[PDB]
Amino acid sequence: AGMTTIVRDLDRPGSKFHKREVVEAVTVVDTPPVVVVGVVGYVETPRG
Amino acid sequence: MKVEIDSFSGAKIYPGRGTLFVRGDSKIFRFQNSKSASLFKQRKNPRRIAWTVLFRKHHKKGITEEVAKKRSRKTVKAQRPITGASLDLIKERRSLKP
Amino acid sequence: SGNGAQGTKFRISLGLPVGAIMNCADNSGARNLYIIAVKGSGSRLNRLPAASLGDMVMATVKKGKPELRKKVMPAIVVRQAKSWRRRDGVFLYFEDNAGVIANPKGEMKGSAITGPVGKECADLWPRVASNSGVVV
Amino acid sequence: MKLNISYPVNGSQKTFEIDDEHRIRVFFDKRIGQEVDGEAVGDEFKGYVFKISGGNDKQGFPMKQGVLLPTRIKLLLTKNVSCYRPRRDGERKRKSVRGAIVGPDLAVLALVIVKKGEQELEGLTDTTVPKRLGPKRANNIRKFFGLSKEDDVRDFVIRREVTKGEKTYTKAPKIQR
Amino acid sequence: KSLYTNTSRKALEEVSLKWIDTASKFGKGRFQTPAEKHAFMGTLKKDL
RNA sequence: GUGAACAGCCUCUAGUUGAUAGAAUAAUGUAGAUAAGGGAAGUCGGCAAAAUAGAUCCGUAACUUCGGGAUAAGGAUUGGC
RNA sequence: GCAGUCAAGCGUUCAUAGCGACAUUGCUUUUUGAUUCUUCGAUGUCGGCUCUUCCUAUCAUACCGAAGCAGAAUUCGGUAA
RNA sequence: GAAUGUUACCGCAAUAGUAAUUGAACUUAGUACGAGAGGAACAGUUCAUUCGGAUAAUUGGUUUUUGCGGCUGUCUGAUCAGGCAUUGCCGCGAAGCUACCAUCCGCUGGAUUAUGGCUGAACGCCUCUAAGUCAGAAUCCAUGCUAGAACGCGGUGAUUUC
RNA sequence: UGUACAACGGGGUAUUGUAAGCAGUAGAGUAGCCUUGUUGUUACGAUCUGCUGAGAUUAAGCCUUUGUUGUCUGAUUUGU
Numbered sequence: 001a002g003m004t005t006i007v008r009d010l011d012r013p014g015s016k017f018h019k020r021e022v023v024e025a026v027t028v029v030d031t032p033p034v035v036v037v038g039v040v041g042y043v044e045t046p047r048g
Numbered sequence: 049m050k051v052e053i054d055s056f057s058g059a060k061i062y063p064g065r066g067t068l069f070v071r072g073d074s075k076i077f078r079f080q081n082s083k084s085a086s087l088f089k090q091r092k093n094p095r096r097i098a099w100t101v102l103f104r105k106h107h108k109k110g111i112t113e114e115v116a117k118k119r120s121r122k123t124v125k126a127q128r129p130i131t132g133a134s135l136d137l138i139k140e141r142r143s144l145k146p
Numbered sequence: 147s148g149n150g151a152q153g154t155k156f157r158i159s160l161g162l163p164v165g166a167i168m169n170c171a172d173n174s175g176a177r178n179l180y181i182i183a184v185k186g187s188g189s190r191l192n193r194l195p196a197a198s199l200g201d202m203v204m205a206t207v208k209k210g211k212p213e214l215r216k217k218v219m220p221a222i223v224v225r226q227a228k229s230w231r232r233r234d235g236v237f238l239y240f241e242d243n244a245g246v247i248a249n250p251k252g253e254m255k256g257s258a259i260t261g262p263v264g265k266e267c268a269d270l271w272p273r274v275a276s277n278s279g280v281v282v
Numbered sequence: 283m284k285l286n287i288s289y290p291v292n293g294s295q296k297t298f299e300i301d302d303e304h305r306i307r308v309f310f311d312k313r314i315g316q317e318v319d320g321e322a323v324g325d326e327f328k329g330y331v332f333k334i335s336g337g338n339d340k341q342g343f344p345m346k347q348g349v350l351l352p353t354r355i356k357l358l359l360t361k362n363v364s365c366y367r368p369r370r371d372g373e374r375k376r377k378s379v380r381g382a383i384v385g386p387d388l389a390v391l392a393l394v395i396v397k398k399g400e401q402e403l404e405g406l407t408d409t410t411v412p413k414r415l416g417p418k419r420a421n422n423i424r425k426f427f428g429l430s431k432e433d434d435v436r437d438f439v440i441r442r443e444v445t446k447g448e449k450t451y452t453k454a455p456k457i458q459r
Numbered sequence: 460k461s462l463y464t465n466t467s468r469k470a471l472e473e474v475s476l477k478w479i480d481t482a483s484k485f486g487k488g489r490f491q492t493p494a495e496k497h498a499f500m501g502t503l504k505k506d507l
Numbered sequence: 508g509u510g511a512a513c514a515g516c517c518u519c520u521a522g523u524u525g526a527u528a529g530a531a532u533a534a535u536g537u538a539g540a541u542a543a544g545g546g547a548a549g550u551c552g553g554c555a556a557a558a559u560a561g562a563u564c565c566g567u568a569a570c571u572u573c574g575g576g577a578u579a580a581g582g583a584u585u586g587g588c
Numbered sequence: 589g590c591a592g593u594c595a596a597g598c599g600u601u602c603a604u605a606g607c608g609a610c611a612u613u614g615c616u617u618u619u620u621g622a623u624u625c626u627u628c629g630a631u632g633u634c635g636g637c638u639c640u641u642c643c644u645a646u647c648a649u650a651c652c653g654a655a656g657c658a659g660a661a662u663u664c665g666g667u668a669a
Numbered sequence: 670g671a672a673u674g675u676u677a678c679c680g681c682a683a684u685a686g687u688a689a690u691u692g693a694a695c696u697u698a699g700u701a702c703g704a705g706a707g708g709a710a711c712a713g714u715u716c717a718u719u720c721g722g723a724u725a726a727u728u729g730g731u732u733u734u735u736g737c738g739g740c741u742g743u744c745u746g747a748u749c750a751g752g753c754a755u756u757g758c759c760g761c762g763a764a765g766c767u768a769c770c771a772u773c774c775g776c777u778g779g780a781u782u783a784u785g786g787c788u789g790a791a792c793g794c795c796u797c798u799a800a801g802u803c804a805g806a807a808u809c810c811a812u813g814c815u816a817g818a819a820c821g822c823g824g825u826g827a828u829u830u831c
Numbered sequence: 832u833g834u835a836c837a838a839c840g841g842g843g844u845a846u847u848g849u850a851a852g853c854a855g856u857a858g859a860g861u862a863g864c865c866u867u868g869u870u871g872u873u874a875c876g877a878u879c880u881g882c883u884g885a886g887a888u889u890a891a892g893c894c895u896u897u898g899u900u901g902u903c904u905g906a907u908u909u910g911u
């Protein structure tokens with residue numbers, strides 16, 4: 001869909017940027033639920 | 049999470065947005081965008097650039113109902129009296145005359 | 147970097163490739179620092195080894211007290227001007243690139259430091275921390 | 283942070299403390315003097331209108347009426363003005379000070395009460411303290427008691443009783459003018 | 460999903476978003492909500 | 508007409524609108540441009556390119572065959588009404 | 589140019605930790621010579637830029653054996669491109 | 670891209686390619702070792718180098734959006750709106766492209782080499798070796814990843830009447 | 832023949848930085864007629880000001896839409 005910015009506190013015991021805000025980049029994927037419409041089955045064969 | 053404003057333009061600077069400029073006198077300048085930040089470098093006067101926050105404030109533009117009051121008074125009036133003389137003797141004996 | 151520098155350093159946009167000349171900001175006598183190298187830098191055919199805040203370079207003095215000229219010495223970048231970006235999303239930059247002459251173990255040479263100094267630099271260099279009036 | 287709440291009508295004052303920063307955020311971007319409904323600060327305070335009077339930030343620096351900003355500035359301060367008690371004659375000094383607009387960098391927030399809510403706040407609305415002194419000049423006694431210049435002061439003044447252990451005594455002011 | 464299980468630490472950290480940028484992305488966006496835009500420049504020739 | 512001007516740039520008279528055409532806008536090119544921070548580290552070499560540029564006023568070094576050097580260098584300033 | 593064997597000697601002591609004389613056995617074809625087979629009805633003749641790949645007689649990086657290896661540093665060697 | 674009845678959808682995987690690299694700080698620890706001077710390493714943590722594949726929230730670059738604004742000449746009587754000067758010049762400029770100049774992400778199982786070992790004869794002793802055998806490397810084979818054999822393949826839908 | 836699709840028009844978004852027109856006691860000032868001034872007056876004056884964050888452009892690879900108009904059977908080919 002696109003991307004955007006995010007702000008959050010950082011939990012990372014060790015970093016000079018621990019417990020401090022970090023602006024970060026993120027991507028939003030559109031995910032309206034999927035409909036199941038079939039089932040297919042697979043076997044082991046000595047050639048695939 | 050502060051939201052500084054453009055020292056020139058005037059609008060808000062949500063996190064990570066625009067640039068920041070530390071001058072030699074160690075004074076900080078934030079710009080929402082390249083536009084102001086250039087018009088800043090270009091020695092332009094904020095009070096001359098019409099859309100700027102500083103322009104409208106100096107030229108008395110769009111204020112309307114802030115151009116009126118509100119409501120912020122109260123009530124008090126009691127008697128804590130003078131201290132060290134029985135504070136009850138100062139409400140009673142205050143019988144007045146006129 | 148490497149010796150004397152207590153701390154790490156998150157990556158900041160390199161702004162001073164070798165041969166760059168930056169304002170010296172201490173009472174050493176030196177007026178400028180001319181970068182001949184960068185401590186810690188890596189190798190790739192035809193890359194100039196560049197410098198950023200809190201970096202320790204190797205430099206000389208172009209214009210300064212004659213007892214600093216004609217010889218190589220450490221120096222520490224304190225002002226960038228090449229707009230770098232921090233982990234709080236800020237795209238900030240000083241008005242000029244600048245640095246102070248220092249020693250191997252990483253201590254100052256002059257009394258104080260004239261002008262601003264990045265946090266990135268002070269946090270790394272205990273000795274700088276002192277002299278640096280305003281920071282960031 | 284911390285709120286120093288004062289009741290002017292009753293001379294009361296208590297220093298309450300609030301974490302839960304979403305509670306505090308009512309105060310943000312509010313100038314010195316702007317009023318504040320109580321239910322936003324808590325429930326104990328519901329109703330109680332609050333006038334914003336002063337306060338302090340980290341490192342202790344004071345606010346100052348009419349400076350705007352939510353930050354520190356270094357002003358030249360004179361006689362007859364806030365945050366500066368001059369030492370020498372016509373002495374001006376350049377000192378730092380905090381902006382008038384509230385932010386999350388304040389150690390304390392000096393509030394006053396304008397109106398009362400649906401709960402008697404403990405060390406505030408319930409408890410009372412006495413105006414530590416009383417009228418001293420002539421027509422100030424007369425106008426504290428409303429007398430019409432007839433009723434002869436002399437005894438229309440307050441008299442403080444102070445016990446000398448085993449010799450309780452009577453000391454009055456001294457009516458000037 | 461993931462074909463392994465990352466002890467990572469760098470992943471493991473449950474993060475909590477403070478704020479998500481909703482200013483326009485069709486240029487130099489300034490205001491989050493159409494309210495915030497109004498609560499700033501106020502009333503215009505169309506508008507009110 | 509602008510301008511020191513037969514320069515550039517626009518126009519009047521006169522004369523032209525002649526040079527295969529259509530559709531797209533991949534790589535690579537020929538020609539024209541701009542780039543953050545650095546500043547010749549590129550290279551045999553600053554090749555190329557960029558910088559400079561009119562005029563009024565101020566200011567001007569070594570050295571000289573005293574004719575020069577010299578727009579030396581370095582500065583300020585310039586519309587409209 | 590690189591690698592051996594014998595081991596008189598060096599290494600305080602101790603031939604072979606690390607080295608090695610007098611001799612002698614080899615490998616390599618990025619040196620230079622010797623040759624003159626191929627091209628004189630033309631195989632475009634240095635170097636750099638660039639880009640790929642391969643060799644190992646390994647500079648660094650992985651894991652090891654050895655020391656005249658206390659630690660640190662270094663050295664000799666194995667698997668290793 | 671013809672041809673293995675037509676057409677469509679979902680897949681398997683031969684063979685082939687293949688990828689990550691190196692450093693530092695904290696900590697260990699002023700520790701072990703040393704009379705002292707000096708002075709480590711495994712585990713853990715935070716960052717970095719070179720490499721690689723992406724991606725455009727932000728920041729920067731780009732400007733024929735000739736989008737808005739300005740300026741110089743001249744031409745349309747002035748006005749309004751405009752034309753011409755190989756895009757006339759100027760400030761700003763969305764979209765797109767794009768930059769360690771921007772941001773993101775770069776898997777873990779096995780088998781071995783050297784080497785050190787167990788058991789153990791030959792050789793009544795001894796020995797990692799002869800039978801047998803354990804542990805082991807930036808190696809190797811997998812895992813993963815990219816292609817998919819247009820003459821390798823499976824599953825499934827639909828299959829025409831003037 | 833419909834949650835259709837298209838051309839426009841509308842609203843969001845975005846760029847520039849305040850459109851033309853009109854008005855004004857703004858404006859260095861300036862002309863002319865006297866009825867020669869206890870604002871004489873009518874003009875005219877770079878620029879300014881107000882309606883006016885106004886006007887203008889905004890998908891050409893932005894978002895959206897109860898509005899308007901229109902469009903919806905031409906061709907060729909294939910069989911175990």
Ligand SMILES: [Mg+2]
Pocket residue numbers: 082
């Ligand atoms: Mg931009």
Ligand SMILES: [Mg+2]
Pocket residue numbers: 191192
């Ligand atoms: Mg080179």
Ligand SMILES: [Mg+2]
Pocket residue numbers: none
């Ligand atoms: Mg000199």
Ligand SMILES: [Mg+2]
Pocket residue numbers: 526
């Ligand atoms: Mg021709």
Ligand SMILES: [Mg+2]
Pocket residue numbers: none
């Ligand atoms: Mg053509």
Ligand SMILES: [Mg+2]
Pocket residue numbers: none
């Ligand atoms: Mg430009």
Ligand SMILES: [Mg+2]
Pocket residue numbers: none
């Ligand atoms: Mg450049």
Ligand SMILES: [Mg+2]
Pocket residue numbers: none
């Ligand atoms: Mg630029």
Ligand SMILES: [Mg+2]
Pocket residue numbers: none
């Ligand atoms: Mg030079």
Ligand SMILES: [Mg+2]
Pocket residue numbers: none
């Ligand atoms: Mg050179």
Ligand SMILES: [Mg+2]
Pocket residue numbers: 551
């Ligand atoms: Mg030469």
Ligand SMILES: [Mg+2]
Pocket residue numbers: 551
């Ligand atoms: Mg040369």
Ligand SMILES: [Mg+2]
Pocket residue numbers: none
């Ligand atoms: Mg040239």
Ligand SMILES: [Mg+2]
Pocket residue numbers: none
């Ligand atoms: Mg230029």
Ligand SMILES: [Mg+2]
Pocket residue numbers: none
């Ligand atoms: Mg000359």
Ligand SMILES: [Mg+2]
Pocket residue numbers: none
């Ligand atoms: Mg002038």
